[PDB]
């Protein structure tokens, strides 16, 4: 009687997905969650994770492959692979050549989640919720402090967002861009930021405890739905700002030392079933990478342009690149200064 150990992002599966898989297959699943690519990457680089499946963002998987931490997926054990969208596979192949190691799961953008009524109360009806100006102009963030501001604890995404806002290459390789203008701006914003955290902002948005967050799209749409279901009067929305935003692709991968590989393939093939992954998207408010599943996704999710954005929005999205030791050094040092004080 076998087990399967899965490590996924929090708030990233439907409530019954695992139970349904267990009932079908007789496999027992141990399911654990993270909210940080850095936490997962540290575990993968430090030794064995004790997991059979993990879910990095593809930009992080790109560098993890060169450490040999994953094993290549045997496509013969993944007959439902045919359901994946060829255009999304090509994009993920920029990180995972020939799609050898990674199964695309969900994708979205890093944008602005906000309480509609509170932001308009503070910055007026014409609050610039369509722009990173809302939170990256110090004068706006000084006012939004009154109702609470969170940033993601995600250094690579935050710096790339700030760099793009400043008109630099989002993946600048100029150290001075990080130590100079990006740091200078973030240090002006810091006094007005309540916390840096990549998951507490969901319930804090939903409950009205913060009014603006840098957030991942589906997380914010979940906060909006939780508030609606609580009938608490809180109106949360999400914006892909006009200056552009980072897109990401989260992907399942199999550690090279996975104990229960056959069971891991069974779960991957299960997630590739159109009705399974559409049901997930319906609950987590993220676009999946399964073309066959799209018609089965609820209209509420499929028709939301902050989840399944149209081509003209997609054209303004950017993706992360791998950096060298120097940039990693200067960026991480700068991030520690920005978060200083807790
Ligand atoms: C169906 O294509 C999805 C595209 O994702 C966004 C990229 C950055 N253009
Ligand atoms: Cl529907």
61-69 LR contacts (CB < 8 Å, sep 24+): 61/95, 61/96, 61/101, 61/102, 61/251, 61/253, 62/94, 62/95, 62/96, 62/322, 63/322, 64/253, 65/96, 65/101, 68/256, 69/44, 69/45, 69/255, 69/256
- If one residue of 92, 248, 297, 314 were mutated to test the ligand 1 pocket, choosing by the most ligand atoms within 8 A of its CB, it would be 314
For residues 142 and 264, state if they share a domain. Answer: no
Contacts for 213 with CB less than 8 Å, ≥ 6 apart: 112, 113, 114, 149, 150, 151, 152, 201, 204, 205, 220
For residues 341 and 285, state if they share a domain. Answer: no
In eight-state DSSP terms, residue 230 is H
For residues 215 and 231, state if they share a domain. Answer: yes
Q: Is the CA virtual torsion 96, 309, 6, 16 positive or negative?
A: negative
- If one residue of 289, 317, 321 were mutated to test the ligand 1 pocket, choosing by the most ligand atoms within 8 A of its CB, it would be 317
Contacts for 175 with CB less than 8 Å, ≥ 6 apart: 326, 327, 330
CA–centroid distance, residue 299 to ligand 2 (Å): 4
Instruction: Tell me the C-alpha distance between 147 and 145, whole Å.
Output: 5
What is the chain's length?
A: 342
For residues 182 and 67, state if they share a domain. Answer: no
* Tally of domains in the chain: 2
State this model's resolution in angstroms. Answer: 1.5
For residues 39 and 14, state if they share a domain. Answer: yes
For residues 86 and 8, state if they share a domain. Answer: yes
For residues 147 and 234, state if they share a domain. Answer: yes
For residues 31 and 148, state if they share a domain. Answer: no
For residues 12 and 112, state if they share a domain. Answer: no
Residue 252 φ then ψ, to 5°: -80, 140
Residue 169 φ then ψ, to 5°: -55, 125
For residues 321 and 228, state if they share a domain. Answer: yes
Q: Token pair for residue 164?
A: 């793009």
Which domain covers residue 218, as residue numbers?
108-248+309-342
For residues 178 and 45, state if they share a domain. Answer: no
Q: How many CB atoms lie within 10 A of CB 267?
A: 21
- Contact by Cβ (8 Å): 56, 40: yes
Comparing C-alpha atoms, which of 294, 320, 287 is closest to residue 106?
287
For residues 127 and 206, state if they share a domain. Answer: yes
Comparing C-alpha atoms, which of 334, 303, 290 is closest to residue 82?
290
Q: Is the CA virtual torsion 16, 303, 33, 148 positive or negative?
A: negative
C-beta 87 within 6 A of ligand 1 = yes
- Contact by Cβ (8 Å): 234, 115: yes
């Amino acid at each position: 009687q076998k087990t399967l150990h899965i490590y996924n992002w929090s708030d990233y599966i439907a409530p019954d997905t695992v139970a349904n898989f267990e009932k079908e297959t007789g496999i027992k699943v141990v399911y654990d969650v993270f909210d940080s690519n850095e936490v997962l990457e540290g575990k993968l680089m430090a030794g064995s994770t004790g997991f059979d499946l993990v879910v990095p963002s593809a930009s992080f998987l790109e560098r993890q492959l060169t450490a040999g931490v994953f094993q290549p997926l045997d496509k013969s054990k993944l007959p439902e692979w045919k359901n994946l969208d060829p255009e999304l596979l090509k994009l993920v192949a920029k990180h995972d050549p020939d799609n050898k190691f990674a199964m695309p799961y969900m994708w979205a953008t890093t944008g602005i989640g906000y309480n509609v009524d509170k932001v308009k109360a503070v910055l007026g009806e014409n609050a610039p919720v369509d722009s990173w100006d809302l939170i990256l102009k110090p004068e706006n963030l000084e006012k939004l402090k009154s109702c609470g501001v969170s940033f993601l604890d995600a250094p690579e995404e935050v710096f790339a967002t700030v760099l793009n806002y400043l008109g630099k290459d989002p993946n600048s390789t100029k150290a001075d861009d990080y130590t100079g203008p990006a740091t200078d701006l973030l240090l002006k914003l810091r006094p007005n930021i309540r916390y840096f955290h990549s998951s507490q902002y969901i319930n804090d948005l939903a409950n009205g405890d913060i009014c603006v967050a840098i957030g991942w799209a589906g997380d914010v749409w979940q906060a909006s739905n939780r508030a609606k279901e609580a009938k608490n009067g809180v109106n949360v929305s999400f914006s892909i700002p006009k200056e552009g935003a980072m897109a990401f692709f989260d992907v399942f991968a199999m550690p090279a030392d996975a104990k229960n590989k056959d069971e891991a393939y069974q779960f991957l093939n299960y997630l590739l079933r159109p009705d399974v992954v559409a049901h997930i998207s319906d609950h987590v408010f993220y676009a999946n990478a399964n073309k066959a599943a799209t018609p089965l996704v609820s209209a509420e999710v499929r028709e939301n342009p902050g989840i399944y954005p149209p081509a003209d929005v997609r054209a303004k999205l950017f993706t992360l690149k791998v950096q060298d030791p120097k940039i990693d050094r200067v960026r991480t040092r700068a991030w520690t200064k920005v978060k200083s004080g807790k």
